[PDB]
């Protein structure tokens, strides 16, 4: 009945079109700030000296970039890991030249997505649901944290963070392959298993449900109209799906329990993305993928190349050309 | 009184026999010195 109590009831209200919640009271300002600065920067930001060698990179549409090539450029290598808000620049133009929009957008984004995870738990609690949708959402959160926060921290610079753009993302991946051999890292391999399997199982489950729908419609209408939102009854026959799938492979390779099946569907890609996030997070500390260069020698001691050696040649090609003006010393130590 | 030899038996052996053969061969290779 107090005004604070009234505000609390409104914030935690389950009748708002968009749930706010306490986590939302943080999510909304941070994500809105990040979105505004990101759109403005992507459209209009001046070039950014990412590599700190006074060689500004054009990232914005108005400076000659298309949607594919445009990006918000990570902050200058001269900044390193230093905190660089607007009020630490002698002018907004100095802030822009050194890639301040990247720091603002990433920090607000990171806070916003952690709050989004908390908000998912919060609404599940208010709806009397089970609480673990946020656990599944923690996989993409972990991956985003790896590329925007953990990798820069381990490498020592926000200039090494993933650029906020499409071609910027490819640059990040290529450089990452050149310096870490992520393809030959087992955690990336589990991430690929996670995403290939997640798509495989999405296709499998979708196709098996769609194949086993109960006849409810006529041939002139979409079969989707055979389901009514809120209906008691199941819209497909899991028994028929299991008969088909257990004959496609063998009876014991097929689920007869929807709860067990939906758990597997949730767990597989989530676990795979946790592994890949941890892989990126550990190569942040330069614990790289497998090195098998010159592993096979003949009796005289001559190197017999393998596919890993050819991959290494590709990596060396990427490495010698990257940041072509940024290195003064022979070893790329970060 | 189940049958001994069926289609499942052959499906199991067609894979299991060469698999154990190959596993032994790959075990032998672990001791090849250059």
């Amino acid at each position: 009945a107090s005004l604070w109590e009234q505000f609390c009831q409104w914030v935690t209200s389950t009748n708002n079109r968009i749930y706010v919640g306490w986590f939302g009271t943080l999510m909304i300002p941070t994500l809105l700030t990040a979105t505004t600065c990101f759109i403005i920067a992507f459209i209009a930001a001046p070039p950014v000296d990412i590599d700190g060698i006074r060689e500004p990179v054009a990232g914005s549409l108005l400076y000659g970039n298309n949607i594919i090539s445009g990006a918000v450029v990570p902050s200058s290598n001269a900044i390193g890991l230093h905190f660089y808000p607007i009020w630490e620049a002698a002018s907004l133009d100095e802030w822009l030249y050194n890639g301040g929009p990247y720091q603002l957008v990433v920090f607000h984004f990171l806070i916003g997505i952690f709050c989004y995870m908390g908000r998912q738990w919060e609404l599940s609690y208010r709806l009397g649901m089970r609480p673990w949708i946020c656990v599944a959402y923690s996989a993409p959160v972990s991956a985003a944290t790896a590329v925007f926060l953990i990798y820069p921290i381990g490498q020592g610079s926000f200039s090494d963070g993933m650029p906020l753009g499409i071609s910027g993302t490819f640059n990040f991946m290529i450089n990452f392959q050149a310096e870490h051999n992520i393809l030959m890292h087992p955690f990336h391999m589990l991430g690929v298993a996670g995403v290939f399997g997640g798509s495989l199982f999405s296709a499998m489950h979708g196709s098996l449900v769609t194949s086993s729908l109960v006849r409810e419609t006529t041939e002139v209408e979409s079969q989707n109209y055979g389901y009514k939102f809120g209906q008691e009854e199941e819209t497909y026959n899991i028994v028929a799906a299991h008969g088909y799938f257990g004959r496609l492979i063998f009876q014991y390779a097929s689920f007869n329990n929807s709860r067990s099946l939906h758990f597997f569907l949730g767990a597989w890609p989530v676990i795979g993305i946790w592994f890949t996030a941890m892989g990126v997070s550990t190569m942040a500390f330069n614990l790289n993928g497998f090195n098998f260069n010159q592993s096979i020698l003949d009796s005289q001691g001559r190197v017999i190349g393998t596919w890993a050696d050819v991959l290494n040649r590709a990596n060396i090609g990427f490495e010698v050309m990257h940041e072509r003006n940024a290195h003064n010393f022979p070893l790329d130590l970060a | 009184t189940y049958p001994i030899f069926t289609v499942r038996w052959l499906a199991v052996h067609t894979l299991a026999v060469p698999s154990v053969f190959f596993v032994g061969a790959i075990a032998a290779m672990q001791f090849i010195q250059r």
Partner: protein
């Protein structure tokens, strides 16, 4: 009782491993593909085709073994065992990469057999054949990547090799020579595969966390009967949760499960279209506007131009070893490289 009907009876028996008419082409073909791959990765070299060790016997590990593609010199020859190259000599057939077309062609016919098995079992059980239709994505990828890409290229040599690191080489080769990440068709494929993973994770999690209290135990898995008529989770609660979290939510379960098939399958088809383009070197390699500008304006740099430079480096440093038949002699002084590094 005619012999055809008696055969169709035995082939369609309910046994541990269903066979069916499709099995006559799925099982021998899949077994040839799998056994050829295991055989090649265990025993067979790529010394005469690639100048590489590619089997466990030579010392490679699971990550580095491969059934490597045949030598460039054979072009697109099907390299039959009895063909004019091997001439029935099994050892020579192994040494010239004959196992690569063996695995690829038996695998293609095995994939045809698996799709026919999907259709056959769907018809026997009485369901719609959407699992078979979903599998067209994987076949589109196999055909475009392992057959049409090398068929458009100079030879089977440039087809991906059947191996972990062989596939990684193929991936990096497509980056450095084709700028395949810039290709919109690949981008649609990435969106499809990542969205498929997302849909899998979010459906699984949503269903598990909107479950109805159907049992007394903490182990909620025991609270489901396969024959029960009632939905095991609340679609209304799920819908409200996602409507208030994400702004929108599924409200039709049939559309939800169709979407879970549509997204990854469509992504595989689109990526396959892009690969077909790459078979002819029809690549989204460059943005000519930005190349013209950087040519005229030396202050102008984007992430796109940087990736172009990365590709030139990869090509120059990888070509001599990756294409040993071309006798690429690139002296050290012509190799592109930035400062110091």
């Amino acid at each position: 009782r005619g012999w055809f009907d008696v055969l169709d009876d035995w082939l369609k028996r309910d046994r541990f491993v269903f066979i069916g008419w499709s099995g006559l082409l799925l099982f021998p073909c899949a077994f040839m593909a799998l056994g050829g791959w295991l055989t090649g990765t265990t025993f067979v070299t790529s010394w005469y085709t690639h100048g590489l060790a590619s089997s466990y016997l030579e010392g490679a590990n699971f990550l580095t073994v491969a059934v490597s593609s045949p030598a460039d010199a054979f072009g697109h020859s099907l390299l039959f065992l009895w063909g004019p190259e091997a001439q029935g000599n099994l050892t020579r057939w192994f040494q010239i990469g004959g196992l690569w077309p063996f695995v690829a062609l038996h695998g293609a016919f095995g994939l045809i057999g698996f799709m026919l098995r999907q259709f056959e079992i769907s018809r026997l059980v009485g369901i719609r054949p959407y699992n078979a239709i979903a599998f067209s994505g994987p076949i589109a990828v196999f055909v475009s990547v392992f057959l049409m890409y090398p068929l458009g290229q100079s030879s089977w040599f440039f087809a991906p090799s059947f191996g972990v690191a062989g596939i990684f080489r193929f991936i990096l080769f497509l980056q450095g020579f084709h700028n395949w990440t810039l290709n919109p068709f690949h981008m649609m494929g990435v969106a499809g595969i990542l969205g498929g993973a997302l849909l899998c994770a979010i459906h699984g999690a949503t269903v598990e966390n909107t479950l109805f209290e159907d049992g007394e135990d903490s182990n909620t898995f025991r609270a489901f009967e396969p024959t029960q008529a009632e939905e095991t989770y609340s679609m209304v609660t799920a819908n409200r949760f996602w409507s208030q979290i994400f702004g929108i939510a599924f409200s039709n379960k049939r559309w939800l499960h169709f979407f879970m098939l549509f997204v990854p399958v469509t992504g595989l088809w689109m990526s396959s279209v892009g690969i077909v383009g790459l078979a002819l070197n029809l690549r989204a390699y460059d943005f000519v506007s930005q190349e013209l500008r950087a040519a005229e304006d030396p202050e102008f740099e984007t992430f796109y131009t940087k990736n172009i430079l990365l590709n030139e480096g990869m090509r120059a440093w990888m070509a001599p070893q990756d294409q040993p038949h071309e006798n690429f002699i690139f002296p050290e002084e012509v190799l592109p490289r930035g400062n110091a590094l």
